[PDB]
Amino acid sequence: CRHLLHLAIQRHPHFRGLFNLSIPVLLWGDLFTPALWDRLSQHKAPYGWRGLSHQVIASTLSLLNGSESAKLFAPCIRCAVVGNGGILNGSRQGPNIDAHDYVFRLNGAVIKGFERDVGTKTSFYGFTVNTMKNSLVSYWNLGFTSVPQGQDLQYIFIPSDIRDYVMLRSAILGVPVPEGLDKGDRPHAYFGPEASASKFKLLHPDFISYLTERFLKSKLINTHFLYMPSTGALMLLTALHTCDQVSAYGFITSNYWKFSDHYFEANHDLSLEAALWRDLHKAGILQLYQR
Ligand SMILES: *[C@@H]1O[C@H](CO)[C@@H](O)[C@H](O)[C@H]1NC(C)=O
Ligand SMILES: *[C@@H]1O[C@H](CO)[C@@H](O)[C@H](O)[C@H]1NC(C)=O
């Protein structure tokens, strides 16, 4: 159980020389050095922070000075990453999703009215501030009136913009976000009453670069005059590095056309990610749900 996942990574030579289970996954205080500031200042996108203010980043990363912000789990782990695809519509995969002890959800995590299909347990919620607010606008009349909240549930920020860093800073302090495109929003309205550093985590920009370099490097790279993996792909791979067993639900498959776009109703490579989950499923590393 507790190591029957990494064994399948060893039995296959393709992913053995691809999985680096030592590069950090989460960014926090004891990693923000002048050296890291010089490197990531040469990269835009969530791969770095070119053109981003040192005052904005040094103030939000210093709030993550706790030793608990380095890891995702407590000091066997079966995880379930639930994508918002339409294949879960009527699948009634509720009992299987909630059977896991850690459930990963992202973006429009519509639960009400679809609990029998996608379950009700939520342990992590990865998102960008852009896609989180966009889903709260378009999917409000479909159930998604708020992001999933819980007692020991933790949120994962994707550092794709200063809106993500400013939101992360205001979420821990409790003060409403005082600047940027999101000026005026109450962090407690999204995430809840508790405002501690143990509640909010940040994905490492070097971890996203490592994923886009080893696992999902497409031909859609127009940097001459950006491209990042989907949030669900970021969550599936983050759980692939931090869990002892992962099951993917509602992710892009070959027979995507048979179902709606979501089970309740932007430069990425859907076909590459879909093929990634296929080859990762043949190797015994991923329990990809299909039908
Ligand atoms: C994996 O990454 C870590 C840190 O970046 C490095 O120390 C290690 O050598 C890498 N592994 C391989 C096989 O390159
Ligand atoms: C798909 O989702 C819709 C919206 O909830 C629902 O009415 C329908 O029964 C589901 N299944 C099919 C096969 O359309």
From Swiss-Prot:
CMP-N-acetyl-beta-neuraminate binds at N84, N107, S230, H262. Belongs to the glycosyltransferase 29 family. Keywords: Disulfide bond, Glycoprotein, Glycosyltransferase, Golgi apparatus, Membrane, Signal-anchor, Transferase, Transmembrane, Transmembrane helix. It is an enzyme of class 2 (transferase). It is a single-pass type II membrane protein. Aberrant O-galactosylation of IgA1 molecules plays a role in the development and progression of IgA nephropathy (IgAN). Genetic interactions of C1GALT1 and ST6GALNAC2 variants influence IgA1 O-glycosylation, disease predisposition, and disease severity, and may contribute to the polygenic nature of IgAN. GO terms for cellular component: Golgi membrane. One of its GO terms (molecular function) is sialyltransferase activity. The keyword Magnesium does not apply. Disulfide bonds join C1-C76, C79-C243. Its EC number is 2.4.3.3. It is found in: Golgi apparatus membrane. The chain holds residues 66 to 374 of 374 of the full protein. Glycans are attached at N20, N65, N89. The keyword Hydrolase does not apply. It comes from Homo sapiens. This is Alpha-N-acetylgalactosaminide alpha-2,6-sialyltransferase 2. Residues 1-291 are lumenal. Pathway: Protein modification; protein glycosylation. Catalyzes the transfer of N-acetylneuraminyl groups onto glycan chains in glycoproteins. Conjugates sialic acid with an alpha-2-6 linkage to N-acetylgalactosamine (GalNAc) glycan chains linked to serine or threonine in glycoproteins. Sialylates alphaGalNAc- and Galbeta1->3GalNAc-O-Ser/Thr epitopes also known as Tn and T antigens. GO terms for biological process: O-glycan processing; protein glycosylation; protein O-linked glycosylation; protein sialylation; viral protein processing. It catalyses: a beta-D-galactosyl-(1->3)-N-acetyl-alpha-D-galactosaminyl derivative + CMP-N-acetyl-beta-neuraminate = a beta-D-galactosyl-(1->3)-[N-acetyl-alpha-neuraminyl-(2->6)]-N-acetyl-alpha-D-galactosaminyl derivative + CMP + H(+); a 3-O-[N-acetyl-alpha-D-galactosaminyl]-L-threonyl-[protein] + CMP-N-acetyl-beta-neuraminate = a 3-O-[N-acetyl-alpha-neuraminosyl-(2->6)-N-acetyl-alpha-D-galactosaminyl]-L-threonyl-[protein] + CMP + H(+); a 3-O-[N-acetyl-alpha-neuraminyl-(2->3)-beta-D-galactosyl-(1->3)-N-acetyl-alpha-D-galactosaminyl]-L-threonyl-[protein] + CMP-N-acetyl-beta-neuraminate = a 3-O-{alpha-Neu5Ac-(2->3)-beta-D-Gal-(1->3)-[alpha-Neu5Ac-(2->6)]-alpha-D-GalNAc}-L-threonyl-[protein] + CMP + H(+). Expressed in skeletal muscle, heart, kidney, placenta, lung and leukocytes. Its main location: Golgi.
